[PDB]
């Protein structure tokens, strides 16, 4: 374990919301779809 410690070292924060914004666009498309449902009466 000491020699593996000496000779090995096993190494290895930002904004992204493309899934949340994809849900945003899907829910607003569903909202205008519900408006289109209410349009036919």
């Amino acid at each position: 374990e000491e020699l593996e410690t000496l000779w090995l070292t096993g190494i290895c924060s930002s904004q992204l919301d493309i899934d949340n914004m994809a849900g945003v666009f899907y829910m607003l498309a569903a909202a205008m779809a519900l408006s289109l449902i209410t349009f036919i009466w």
């Binding site: 914004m21 205008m32 349009f39």
Partner: peptide, 27 residues
């Protein structure tokens, strides 16, 4: 010792147009 906000702005540009469309459509 950003671009997604511009996408949201284009989205609300769509929103205002479709709200005026529902204003004209719905009695």
């Amino acid at each position: 010792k950003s671009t997604l906000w511009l996408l949201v702005g284009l989205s609300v540009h769509v929103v205002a147009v479709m709200l005026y469309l529902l204003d004209r459509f719905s009695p």
